[PDB]
Write a protein that binds this ligand. Structure first.
Ligand SMILES: Cc1cc2nc3c(=O)[nH]c(=O)nc-3n(C[C@H](O)[C@H](O)[C@H](O)COP(=O)(O)OP(=O)(O)OC[C@H]3O[C@@H](n4cnc5c(N)ncnc54)[C@H](O)[C@@H]3O)c2cc1C
Ligand SMILES: O=C(O)c1ccc2ccccc2n1
Ligand SMILES: O=C(O)c1ccc2ccccc2n1
Ligand SMILES: [Mg+2]
Lengths: 1195, 112, 56
């Protein structure tokens, strides 16, 4: 057996002094970055004057020189413009010109014209300069009909010709490299050069990478043939993206990148060498920068490439590492003797870098946050490059006339071709650089970055290329409200004279500050940072040497019991620790001890209980590396998932602490001893969340961890105790299900928090139903269980994004998330292409023991889990279903692994059981059957997570209004719900609620619920109002008043947006639960129950056995429509909760009958007739609404 | 300006539907659309599917999309005032069909 | 002002919508009240006219 973590993440090569200085700058505070850039960028007053004059002259020439003319000629609205361009786009998909012009004149002009508007967001940016994440296809359809009926064939013709020019000539230099080469001769004659960008990146499959490879190979031949020996400065070159050449281009896959991607780059470079053309490596996301340097190093040191100076490399000046990267490159050019071509750009991924750093909770951003800092960085890096023109060839890619002029004068009067050059984008940059190239202008050369590809390819990522925004230069030069004096303002002097040099942008939150004053965000760890990986390697190895133990930790001290070893599910030879399990006697003893200590813990003020949680959060944050290693080895998790789990534990602690500070006072009495039963799949996070909530609500806790994962739970309890939770308030009871049953059955147990299987949840519900609290009320149960989670994808979604989100949602954590994607639903027209991509992505996953950074998918938790999952796969295969599986390595035999698996089903009903493993089922649907599909998804009875990938607002509105799920996700993955941002919990067979990490949670753990923050609604249910009027007409005056009060008190209709990361909208809403079972005893009781259910938007099923049918005579039809009568509760379900009236004996008997009902576990509230009369909140309206979280990826 | 019930037929004067009443083929007014689809319309379309009334099921879905039910706009006006314009259901529509397919089409129009 | 607003409103609405397939009804009888004897008078007539209908 390999030693744990001995090969966790070894660097490609030992980190030199220069490489270390890059890494050290990765997230350096912006105030530390800017002062040396300002100094390096400083130029004389004479130069700054001359630069401003040159910049003014360039801008004046620009301002002295299509879609707008079309809009004005035909009086188009913006939506009509966008719709017209979408129509033109679709008309250009008809390849035969004759059939198209025919279709226009004969059919499309006549009126009746995959959505036409799939790419409308792109045309919206073209027409309006504004970007929307999704498309209002109904508005665009209306607009298209309007403009055609108003203007006919002539406007369709103009739109077609406009779109033809833009897509064939302006957005791309040519559709093919041959055509682009032909079209390049005109500007080449005038002194420009070219670098061709074969529109293509982010290989998803091996076949995709191979396709991009042979595209680059064929393009290099074509470019080299055309170059005809002009060399790397006068002649054309190519630009490549490393992410196009390998489907797993990342630091986590560094060995595969060096073994498989690097040889492909070398082969292409050898070809570019043969023709003596430039080959430029484009720069991508921040977490790929340093990895790409290892490839650049090997290439530049490879003697087979000697004699050629065409190797090029982009550096992004918006990145904090840029000057240190240049130091490294310049030195590498000296060591290798290769004059590396260095393209200095600002950077194209800014929005995404901000969002990624916030999501990952990292210390700071890897890019600047004020555009003016990037400009200073750019000029500062230009100075460094201009000092090194003997060993590198600087290529100053910019459209900013101020930037250009500064460098032009910085470079000085001495110039020769090959000293340096400028660069610009095809279409975009020619107006500026026709004022630069040529002896009549500034006599400096410019290389045109020339996109090459078809319309479909072009439309794939044209949005990002166009954002390159109110702060962008090309936007501001066309803004007549922006003067030239503004455009020529020297960013270096502006930054030098700001109050704090290099201050972060005011309106961008650091990751730690995402939640402002409410709470401190958990911090993550950057697994692309070599310092982090080196430090983590040691902390993880150290964690693997510790003799982890878990014992029964009672109020009186650790107890004796039977002891057994805890094993790594990825390698049973790897012993992780020892668990001493709890005897049933000591489990029952622990509950009595909790009961005896309950008043002393409840007497700790809420703020001090919250302070214990906050202190524990600090401790878990500090101990995260060690907690990571334990979770990795005990739970079989990857490092990335273990980081997220520790973050979630921290977030739960701080979130429930803040919620407590917002809500809890003396009248919110604790339930008493709470049994917290946690699962093995989140053995720290859910463990901590349930325990933290119960404790901070003032309840002592009996913590029963999953038998598979006791060690991390024992460490969680140790940390909570160190934080100040007394031993009598938090006891740890490791063991099997018999321990948990003993805890649940104990007479002093006042509540149960359970996360796990439906089977155990139903056993707990049945046991609790056998008893009542001393006050004669049901023992509260929070039970959260699995889901049959679906994702629906239509033909407007981006396949590559879908596939990434599906691979992650289905196979992350070996599919052992309650939120994991189980059923993918693909619209028929795109199903085969997405399935092909999905299967290719499947085979790029690395499955193995999780103490290696390169492992994507670890083991399943047990042999029994593995057998249960594989039995499902084999049954599907035996029924003839197509089954795709990754072949596992022989090393997996020492653990319990299931290969990620894709199973093609005929109908959603072919899947009949929860399969809690890495097994994705795929079904296909016709567009017209979308509504029936949503019916089919709802019909499973689950309602945990649901994903929708579409760009169409009409589809979003339809699906999200019809689907019944507690956590919705639009255009992103469906896993990893964030505490306080996507409160997590579903309906139906998926849980009782309230949602974990949401504002109703603590209220379930006290005997009188507080009013949560922001918890109210101005909407009054109309059927409630009708019922209140009916009650008054019946003479039931007190009940009418109670109904009116319930109508106001209900929070039905609450609709909030929760603070979170940029590029995402996180919504939280309160809806009706569904149909509530009403079991009244008296007429007044029935009226109160009806008022409570109706005020929260529900319908009801009233127990016919009550004999109260005569109490509802002459109901308004509106109320009658919500009222049914049930003689057989099991036959008339599913219900969504229950209200019960009776004495203690009657409540217990009803509670037992409800516990036996098939289907969902009902959240039951019971009260005596007297309690209904004395207590206006006998029934709590919190538990009669359903929480819905929706997370929309707006990036 | 204009009401319902005993107060008028509509469409409102000084509003975007007015001119369309005065031509034999109504145009699509500016901003006249909605992303909302009536759920009973959707249920009716599925029922049409189930009995094979394919032409009627298609008409039902198209009407579901064509309907501007749920339009919710703010109209330009003076400061210190919010002026809103919304499209709601009319109420109960009297259907006088002659044929079964005619009835399905009328029902689709009304439910949408 | 209201009469002016009707004229300009229906004029703009026409420019935004009416094309050759939006055929006129034909003669439209506009009957107007005494309480807004210019504004409603003008509004009904202007709408009918701009939609391509002669007005009584
Ligand atoms: C020929 C060419 C090739 C290129 N190749 C690449 C490449 O391989 N990889 C890559 O990442 N980029 C590349 N770029 C850069 C990118 O595509 C944009 O073109 C470029 O960033 C625009 O910069 P500017 O000087 O033209 O315009 P400007 O308006 O001067 O600069 C805009 C830039 O400022 C930066 N910025 C915007 N807002 C902020 C902010 N709030 N805080 C900090 N910085 C901000 C962004 O980088 C933005 O692009 C290339 C550009 C050109 C011209
Ligand atoms: O921790 C468990 O795995 C557990 C907890 C409580 C239980 C109650 C009844 C039956 C099984 C149980 N299993
Ligand atoms: O002692 C046990 O290990 C135990 C006891 C009861 C159980 C009920 C359902 C599932 C597992 C169980 N496991
Ligand atoms: Mg067991």
């Amino acid at each position: 057996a390999p030693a744990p973590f001995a090969d966790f993440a070894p660097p490609v090569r030992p980190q030199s002094t220069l490489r270390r200085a890059i890494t050290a700058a990765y997230r350096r505070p912006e105030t530390e970055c800017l002062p040396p850039l300002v100094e390096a960028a400083t130029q004389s007053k004479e130069i700054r004057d001359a630069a401003a004059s040159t910049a003014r002259k360039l801008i004046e020439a620009l301002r002295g020189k299509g879609v707008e003319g079309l809009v004005q000629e035909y009086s188009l609205s913006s939506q009509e413009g966008v719709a017209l361009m979408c129509l033109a786009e679709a008309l250009l998909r008809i390849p035969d010109t004759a059939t198209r012009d025919a279709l226009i004149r004969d059919k499309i002009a006549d009126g009746n014209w995959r959505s036409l508007f799939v790419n409308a967001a792109t045309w919206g940016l073209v027409v309006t300069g504004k970007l929307t994440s999704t498309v209002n296809d109904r508005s665009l359809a209306a607009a298209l009909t309007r403009l055609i009926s108003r203007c006919g064939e002539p406007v369709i013709r103009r739109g077609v010709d406009m779109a033809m020019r833009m897509m064939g000539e302006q957005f791309v230099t040519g559709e093919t490299i041959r055509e682009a080469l032909k079209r390049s001769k005109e500007l080449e004659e005038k002194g420009f050069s070219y670098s061709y960008d074969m529109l293509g990146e982010a290989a998803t499959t091996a076949a995709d990478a191979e396709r991009y490879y042979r595209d680059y190979e064929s393009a290099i031949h074509a470019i080299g043939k055309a170059s005809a020996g002009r060399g790397i400065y006068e002649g054309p070159g190519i630009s490549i993206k490393l992410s196009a050449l390998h489907p797993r281009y990342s630091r986590a896959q560094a060995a595969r990148v060096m073994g498989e991607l690097l040889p492909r780059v070398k082969a292409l470079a050898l070809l570019a060498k043969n023709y003596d053309i430039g080959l430029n490596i484009d720069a991508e996301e921040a977490d790929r920068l340093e990895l790409s340097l290892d490839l650049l190093e090997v290439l530049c040191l490879d003697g087979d490439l000697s004699g050629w100076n065409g190797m090029g490399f982009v550096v992004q000046a918006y990145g904090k590492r840029c000057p240190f990267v240049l130091d490294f490159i310049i030195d590498l050019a000296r060591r290798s003797g290769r004059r590396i071509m260095v393209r200095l750009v600002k950077g194209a991924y800014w929005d995404a870098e901000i969002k990624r750093a916030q999501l990952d909770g990292l210390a700071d951003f890897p890019v600047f946050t004020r555009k003016i800092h990037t400009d200073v960085s750019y000029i500062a890096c230009a100075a460094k490059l201009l000092a090194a023109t003997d060993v590198v060839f600087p290529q100053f890619a910019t459209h900013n006339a101020q930037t250009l002029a500064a460098i032009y004068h910085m470079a000085g009067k001495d110039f020769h071709v090959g000293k340096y050059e400028f660069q610009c984008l095809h279409g975009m940059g020619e107006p500026l650089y026709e004022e630069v190239v040529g002896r009549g202008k500034l006599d400096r050369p410019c290389r045109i970055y020339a996109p090459v590809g078809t319309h479909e390819t072009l439309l794939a990522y044209l949005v990002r290329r166009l954002l390159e925004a109110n702060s962008s230069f090309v936007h501001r030069i066309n803004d007549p409200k922006v003067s030239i004096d503004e455009l020529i303002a020297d960013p270096v002097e502006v930054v030098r004279a700001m109050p704090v040099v290099g201050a972060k942008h005011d309106r961008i939150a650091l990751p730690a500050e995402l939640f402002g004053d409410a709470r401190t965000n958990s911090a993550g760890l950057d697994l692309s940072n070599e310092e982090t990986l080196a430090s983590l390697t040691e902390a993880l190895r150290e964690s693997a040497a510790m003799k982890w133990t878990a014992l029964p930790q009672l109020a009186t001290g650790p107890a004796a019991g039977e002891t057994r070893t805890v094993l790594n599910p990825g390698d049973h030879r790897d012993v992780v620790g020892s668990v001493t399990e709890t005897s049933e006697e000591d489990a029952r003893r622990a509950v009595r001890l909790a009961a005896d200590a309950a008043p002393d813990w409840a007497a700790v003020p809420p703020s001090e209980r919250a302070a214990c949680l906050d202190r524990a959060a600090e401790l878990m944050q500090a101990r995260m590396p060690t907690l990571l290693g334990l979770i990795i080895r005990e739970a079989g998790k990857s490092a990335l998932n273990a980081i997220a789990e520790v973050r979630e534990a921290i977030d739960f602690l701080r979130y429930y602490a803040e919620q407590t500070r917002r809500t809890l006072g003396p009248g919110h009495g604790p339930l008493g001893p709470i049994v917290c039963i946690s699962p093995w799949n989140f053995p720290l996070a859910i463990f901590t969340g349930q325990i933290a909530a119960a404790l901070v609500a003032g309840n002592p806790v009996l913590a029963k961890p999953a038998e598979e994962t006791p060690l991390i739970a024992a460490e969680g309890v140790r940390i909570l105790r160190e934080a100040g939770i007394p031993a009598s308030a938090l006891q740890l009871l490791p063991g099997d299900g018999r321990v948990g049953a003993a805890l649940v059955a104990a007479a002093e147990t006042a509540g149960v928090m359970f996360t796990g299987s439906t089977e155990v949840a139903r056993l707990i519900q049945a046991q609790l139903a056998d008893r009542l609290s001393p006050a004669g009320r049901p023992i509260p149960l929070i039970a959260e269980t699995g889901g049959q989670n679906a994702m629906i994808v239509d033909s407007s979604a981006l396949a590559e994004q879908v596939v990434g989100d599906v691979i992650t949602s289905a196979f992350d954590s070996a599919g052992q998330r309650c939120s994991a994607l189980r059923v993918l639903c693909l619209q028929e027209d795109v199903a085969d292409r997405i399935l092909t991509m999905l299967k290719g992505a499947l085979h790029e996953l690395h499955i193995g023991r999780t103490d290696r950074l390169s492992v994507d998918v670890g083991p399943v938790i047990t042999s029994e889990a593995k057998d249960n999952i594989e039995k499902h796969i084999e049954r599907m295969r035996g029924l003839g279903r197509k089954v795709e599986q990754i072949g596992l390595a022989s090393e997996t035999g020492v653990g319990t692994f299931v290969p990620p698996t894709i199973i093609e089903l005929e109908k959603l009903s072919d899947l009949q059981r929860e399969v809690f493993g890495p097994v994705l089922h795929v079904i296909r649907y016709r567009r017209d059957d979308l509504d029936r599909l949503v019916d089919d998804v709802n019909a499973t009875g689950y309602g945990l997570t649901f994903g929708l990938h579409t760009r169409l607002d009409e589809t979003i509105a339809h699906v999200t209004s019809r689907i019944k799920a507690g956590n919705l996700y639009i255009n992103r993955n469906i896993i990893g719900a964030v505490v306080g941002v996507q409160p997590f919990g579903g309906r139906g067979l998926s849980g009782t609620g309230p949602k974990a990490g949401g504002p109703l949670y603590l209220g379930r753990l006290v005997t009188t619920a507080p009013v949560p923050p922001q918890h109210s609604s101005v909407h009054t249910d109309p059927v409630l109002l009708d019922f209140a009027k009916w009650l008054d007409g019946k003479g039931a005056r007190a009940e009418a008043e109670a109904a009116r009060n319930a109508g106001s008190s209900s929070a039905l209709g609450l609709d909030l947006e929760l603070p979170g990361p940029v590029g995402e909208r996180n919504l939280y809403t309160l809806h009706a639960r569904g149909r509530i079972l009403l079991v009244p005893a008296t007429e007044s009781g029935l009226y109160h129950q009806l008022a409570a259910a109706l005020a929260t938007g529900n319908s009801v099923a009233i127990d016919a056995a009550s004999g109260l049918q005569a109490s509802l005579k002459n109901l308004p039809q509106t109320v009658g429509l919500r009222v049914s009568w049930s003689k057989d509760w099991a036959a008339d379900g599913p219900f969504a909760g229950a209200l019960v009236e009776g004495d203690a004996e009657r409540i217990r008997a009803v509670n037992k009958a409800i516990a036996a009902l098939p289907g969902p576990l009902l959240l039951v509230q019971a009260a005596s007739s007297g309690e209904i009369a004395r207590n206006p909140d006998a029934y709590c309206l919190n538990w009669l609404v359903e929480e819905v979280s929706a997370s929309i990826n707006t990036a």
